[PDB]
Each structure stands twice: as C-alpha cells, then as structure tokens.
Symmetry: D2
Subunit: 256 residues, 4 copies
C-alpha cells in the first residue's frame, strides 16, 4: 500500500520526466522555465503565446522592493544570520490574504462576473459591495489614474497587441476599472487583479493561481537575502519610538 | 536613521527597477526569467550564452520526484490541508547540507582545486580525503558510469558544444570524475557538483550559489502541492511497521 | 507614527513585564510556565484551578509519537541536517485543519451547541451533518469505547473531581459522546474535542485556542529533533514501493 | 526496513509514554511542564532542584518585547493575516546565531574555559579574542553594571541560594564578568551566557541547549500573534524614510 500518489514528475529514469517530457529534451528543443512551470503545475505544455505571457507575469512580479512583507521577512532573517533557504521560507510564509492572496480572489470574482453578470457591471458591483466588500484586484495605496502601474499597463498592452488570446476575465476587469476609477482615482485594476484575470484566461485552475506570486517573489527574496549578506548587514532591532507599548498597569505579583 | 539599506530593487517609480533596469523594458526587449535572476542576485545582466546556461540549470533542477526531502515536505503539508505558500515554505526549509547544499561545497572545493592544485589531481584528492572526507559533487546512490545522470551529461554537452564559455572548475571536476569512477563506478560527477562548478565558472559568488536550487525546486514543490490538492489527498500517517520504537522501559512515576 | 502597537509585554525595564507582572517576581512567588502562558495569551493571571488545568492540557498534549505530521516534519528536517529552530518551524507549519486545528472547531461548534441547541442533541447533529460535515472533536482512527483515550479520560476526571469549574461545552460534548458511541464504537470524544471544550469553558479567547497545541507539540518536536541528532540519523528517502507513480505516458517533446 | 528510529515517545498505548512514563500519571503525581521537557529532551525525569531551574529558565525567557526578531517576525505574519502556527513558524525561523544562538556558544566556550583554562581567565580571554571574537554570553546593548539585567541577577541568586547544584561553568562566567565589567560597564554576563552555563552545569546534552530558547520564545510569539489579532492590526509596510535605497543608476535596457 503506497504512502503517496504522484502524477506530475518521474525521477526513476536517466533524468526526470515532467508531465511525460524529458527535462533535457525540453532544453534541447528551446523551451524555457515558463514551459516547465506549465508542465509541473498544469500538466500541459503552454502554447507559444501562453508561454510569452507566463514569462512576463514572472518577470513583472519578481520583486517590489524591501518594504513589503515577503522581502522584509527574508531581510529580517538575513540580518539575524539565517541561511538563505530558511530566510526565504520565512518571507514566503507571509504570502496570504494581505500579501499576494488577492490574485486568487480577483480571479475567482472576475470569473463569476463573466459567468453571472456578463452584460451587467452595476449588478456585479452591487453584489460585490453586499457580499464581499471592496472588489479584489481593484484599488491601490499610491497607484492611480494619475500615477499608473506600468506593470499593469505593460501586461495588458502585451496580451492585447502581441497575442491573439481571448481574455474575458481581464476584459471584464478593464470595463469595471473604467467605472471604479470614475468613482475614485485610486480604484485602478491593480497588479493582483490583472494577473488573477490573465491566469483564469490562460485556463489555470483556481488553486494553482497562487503559484505565480510564490515562485516570482522567491526570485526577489533570494536577491534580498544575497544583498543583505553582501553588505554584512547587522541584526535588525525595531527602534523604540516605532513601538506603541499600550501595556497593562505594572502590578505586584499576589501571594498564592 | 534608516532601518534597512537595499541595493537591488527600486519600487518607488511607475514599476520596479531591477539593478537599474525597468521590469517592462526587460520584457519588451525579449529578456527572460533567467535574466531577472542574474539582475536580482548578481546585479548584472547575463550575456546571451550565460542566460542560456542559467535557463537550463533551472529547467534541469525544477524537480526530482516526490521521495526527496523538499518535495516530500511540501506533500506532507499539502496532505495536512496547509495552504500552498506555507506548504512550500516547509519543503524549502529542508534545503541544507544533505538536500541541495553540496552545490555550494562542490563550487568551493573545485574552485580551490583550480587555484591550489592546477596540475595536481592526486594532491587535491589526498588533501580532500584528509581534510573534508568524500569530495562534494562526487558520488550518487544509483547513478553511475553504467547508469548515467542525463541531467549532468546534457548540461556538460550544452556548455561545451553550444557556448564559448571557459569553464575551469567544471573542466577540473570532469578530470577528477575520470579518476574517481576508475576507483568505483558510482563516483560520478553528480548534478550538485556539475551545477556548483558551472555557477563558479559563470562568476556567481559562493553565497549566491544556493539560490539556483532554492528557486528551481520551488517550481517542483508548488507542482507537488497542486497535484496533492487536485487528487484531494488524505492526511499522511507513517505506517506503524515503518517506525522502530526503540523506546525506554515503561516505568511507574515515582512519588514526589 | 509607531509601526506596531503591543499590549502584552514590556521589555524596557530591568526585566520583562508580562501583562504587567515582573517575570522574576512570578518565579519568586512560586508561579509556573502555565501562569506565564495565561498572562501572555489572555492578559490574566490564572486562578489556581485554571493554572492546574492549563498545566495538564500542555503535559497531555506534548507529543503523540513520530508518525504524526508535526513530529514527522521535524524528523525529516533533522535527518536532512537542518538546525533545531528551522526543523521545528517546518513541523509547526503542519498545524492546521487536519493536524491540531479541530481543537478550535470543536470549541466553536460545542459553544454553538450550548447556545443554540441546549436540550437538542438531534438538532445539533442534524445541523452539523448538513452545514459542516463530521462533528469536530468526535471520532478516532483507533481509540474507541473498547480502547479508550486515557488522555481524555484523565482530563475529564480531573476537571470534574478536582476542580469546581463549570464546564457547559465539555458537558454537552460528553452527552453527544453517549449518543455517537451508541451508533459506532469509534465515535468517541477525542482529545481535540476535550481540550477545545475545556478551553471554551475556561473563557479563553477564540483566537488563543490553537496556542495550546502549537506550544505543547513544540516540546515534542524539539525532543524529536534532539533524538534524531543524538542517533546521527541518516537522510530520509521515501522507499520506491511507498510511492504510486501515476504519471503521464512518456512522450517526445514537439518542435516549437 | 523501518524508515525512522525513535527513542523518546511511544503513542501506541492508551496514552503516550514520554521516556517510559505515562503522561496522565505524571499529571496525577504532581509533575509539571518542566518535567515533560526533561523527559522528552534528555530522557530523564529531573530532580526537584533541576525541575525548579528548568521552570525558571522557561518563565524568564518567555518573551522580551515586540522589537526582537522572533516576536517581530510573528507580528509581521499576524499583520499579513497568516494563521497562528505558520506565523509563529516564521518567527521561530529567526532563531540562530544573532537571536538566541549565543546560549549554545556560551555553554560550549565556558565549558572549554573550565576544562582548559581553570585558573587562567587571561588565557581564556586571549584565546577567545584570537579564535572566536567577542565572548558569547558577555555584553549587552543597554544592560550594564549601572542597569543590571534582573533576569540574570534572579537566576544566579536562585541557583546559588535555593539549590545545592554545583555550577562550575556559571561560576567561571561570573569570574569573567568581574574582569570584563571592570574594563567596560556594558560587558556583563548576559541572559544567554547565564542560561547556557546553567544548562551545561545541569548536564543537558549540547544538542538540547537551543530547545530552551525555542520553547520559551514560542510562548511569547503565540502571545504576540493573539495580541495583533485581538487588535485587528493592519498590514505592516516599512515607512519609506526607514529604507535607504542605495540602488544602481537608472539605465535603458540594451538590445539583445
Ligand atoms: O470612499 P468610499 O469608501 O466611500 O468609496 C467611494 C465609492 O467607491 C466604491 N469603492 C471603494 N473601494 C472600492 C473597491 N476596492 N472596489 C470597488 N468599489 C470600491 C464604493 O463602493 C463607493 O461607490 P458606491 O457609492 O457606488 O458603492
Ligand atoms: O569503497 P571506499 O569507501 O573504500 O572507496 C574506494 C575509493 O574511492 C574513494 N572515494 C570514495 N568516495 C569518494 C568520494 N565521494 N569522492 C572521492 N573519492 C571517493 C576512496 O577514497 C577510495 O580511494 P583511495 O583508496 O584512493 O582513497
């Protein structure tokens, strides 16, 4: 009775087979990292145009500076003298509802919009406000109509002008963006919404969606760990004035 | 007084700059994930031939089945119902001296061989036996002269026949392999030794070396998590006969 | 302006204050680890009976062998040569819906049972079957009416015969057990259900419930890491026959 | 044939046996968490004096505010919406050479001092300066002769006045402190040095020393996670002025 069942990778031969294809044969025939991602996560070789999109999603989301949770977690561990894989694992642990997770929720709700509200953006927005609250993939702290997110503008322009891919989730999100930005300038289609829609339009299943942010941000977290080690950075201690000690009154311990 | 100092990535503009280059501009000009890796880990755009090698190292090492520590850790967490980033972080935590770590040690000692024993393989082997023990990057449990590692054979053949790159560490390791395999057939140049030498020959610094295994194996760990979730796999419990309970004699608790 | 707000601990003096009490003063006056747990997790010094219960919950939950996810994760990392904190972090990552998490759900649903179905076990069981699935805290793979869980029998007997604590959630769960075990012998009140109910009955906040399993099992995971290191245990590799390779048929890679 | 060998815990009976003792029997006879720690980490029931020391080490070490790496890592994950076990695993990942790790080094080097430099503090200090660097367990950022660490003063006073335990490592460290504090007021025997020496003097195995900091700080990290969740704390973003962007000059991407 086997303990585990696996379907994606076979290491038993002279080299691993990813969804039935020999790793060196993928290399030899000119395939890339983006193609191995499609094979191991979706058991399907991407088409030429899908491959170009996967490559761009990873490149555009590789890093977003040291202030955000994943990179900061990796930096904190690097400065505490932790080895690279363990430091990057601490930063990766930050990926969830507030850091990267909106990719999945945006994919889910824009897919629902296409299926249940195809010719009804007001109905979709009304249902979202009532049942979810803010629309996942809409809104940014600083990026806006006046200050666009070039990561979004580039990905959208590339998929629309350099591919023939039909993108109904992304198309719907772009129509919603026109409405939400008319309400408030900061209500843009953000990079999580963009990637979430594109991945649904590339036929990736809902539970694979987070893989793209996890993998891409690992590139950046490894980079931040290397950077801190190159600088011989010292242990981080949060400055006292950055902490609000809203603690209980000091008390004497009562006798038992 | 800033809390942290960063040198690799600037998110303050319309899009991130990786070692001074705009992410969308790298995409537009036909660069890939392998190029973003070079920028974020080494602050240098790889040459055309270096880029082809980085791409192949990642593709060849993306996964090696579910039995090994990283993939198995990710599977265990997936079967316990843990979300993808946290499950992959558990598998990534396994990367160290026995799982992936030999890449760094092989790079270090073959670089030392080139510098200190250039025309003296017997001297290098004698020093290694006395001061280290088995040579890192030499030996495999099942792969041998009779059963070659096609991952090694492919990477070596590609860098030698499809690039003009000078590879002194790899060349030295290949010369050592001829000697060690003459001693015992299983003493091949393994994939860790191969990649470790190539990365030293691509001028990556010693402490960046582990990034390649960490990033590549994240592709596979994400895949294994998705696979277990697609199958709706049940909680793993190690079968009783697989555990040797070499426990102490059962004793009564003494009165205090 | 402050980055974080904290309410539980103040390190600024000659020693830390936990919910207002000096650590050495707690030691001096004969308080224990269980008292520090109550202070840091609930900002309240436990009463003597509450302290006795917290102590017992931790002792009973410290470990449950090497086959379960947390201990096994810690062992896998120990055998891969990973340092103790990082190895224990990998095992801790396994704590979730299938490993330990049922403590919180059992607490939540038995509290709901007391409030919404006080004299109606059939109504509670019907609602649970329809809206949740199997009742959290009910059932075990091997423990049963014939083979009782002495951890449960002890905790129940102690709280009923050695304390005056009012336990409505636990009382309800015990009444449910009388019904479910009459249906099938394995439908016992399990240790997660027992602890979850007791914690609810102790008025511990819903957010804190998982702390008890996390802390207690850390004792066992540290032990397993030490044990594997004392034995100089070798790298674990899952035996080939324990893996079902339900992989895709081998295919040639198509030309681009 | 078995995959793993275990010696500390047996779950196969009606309840787990820790180093041969039944968990409920330890509870019944008045033993505590500190006794379970001795059993699972050292396979020996502590004596009453050893038990009192273990209890105090854990209580004194439970937390040291939110500014330090472990607690801060747990807070960062809590504020990113990560579940408790995974958040605490991120904080635990910070435990290493700069955060908690000095306990082991101080134990190791003060044991060496007793064995190799018994009546020779200048010889020990000279060897340490030449071969190690700053003496592990000596020095503090803010605690000094003028501002003592009450955690140290309490533990030292308790073991000297309330036990008959022979403490040669601790005695040596205290003699070193008399010399180093005469050189500079901040060169005190710190809490890591104190605990490390005491653990060595208790004959705990070198492999186990880190267990005490890992376990104790898990109490605090769980507390910090609960605290942030009670407050419904927002996502942390490191303020721009706290980051020094020492980035490369912006450049155009060259054509391939
Ligand atoms: O500022 P407010 O929070 O009041 O938001 C202003 C508008 O933007 C909408 N809005 C705010 N955040 C939003 C988000 N992330 N997604 C969609 N709409 C959003 C509000 O619902 C409101 O519009 P409405 O009155 O049509 O519902
Ligand atoms: O079987 P053994 O362990 O005795 O090894 C046989 C030979 O292979 C060598 N060897 C074994 N493992 C090796 C490794 N990983 N790298 C290099 N040489 C190795 C041994 O040193 C011995 O050769 P020697 O007698 O010239 O030193």
């Amino acid at each position: 009775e086997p303990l585990i069942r696996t379907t994606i990778s076979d290491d038993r031969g002279e080299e691993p087979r990813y969804a039935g294809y020999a790793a060196s044969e993928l290399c030899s025939k000119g395939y890339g990292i983006e193609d191995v991602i499609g094979l191991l996560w979706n058991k399907k070789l991407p088409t030429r145009e899908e491959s170009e999109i996967i490559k761009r999603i990873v490149m555009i989301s590789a890093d977003h500076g040291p202030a955000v949770s994943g990179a900061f977690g990796s930096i904190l561990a690097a400065c505490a003298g932790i080895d690279m894989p363990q430091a990057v694992s601490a930063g990766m642990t930050m990926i969830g509802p507030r850091f990267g997770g909106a990719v999945t929720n945006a994919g889910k709700y824009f897919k629902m919009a296409v299926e249940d509200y195809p010719n009804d953006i007001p109905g979709f927005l009304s249902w979202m406000k009532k049942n979810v609250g803010p629309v996942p993939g809409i809104g940014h702290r600083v990026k806006s109509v006046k200050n666009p997110d070039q990561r979004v503008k580039y990905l959208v322009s590339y998929i629309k002008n350099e591919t023939s891919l039909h993108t109904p989730c992304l198309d719907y999100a772009l129509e919603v963006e026109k409405v939400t930005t008319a309400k408030k300038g900061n209500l843009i289609l953000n990079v999580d919404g963009t990637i979430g829609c594109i991945l649904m339009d590339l036929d990736f299943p809902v539970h694979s969606l987070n893989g793209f942010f996890v993998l891409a941000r690992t590139i950046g977290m490894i980079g931040h760990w290397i950077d801190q080690n190159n600088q011989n950075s010292r242990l981080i201690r949060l400055y006292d004035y950055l902490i609000n000690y809203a603690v209980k009154p000091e008390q004497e311990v009562p006798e038992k």
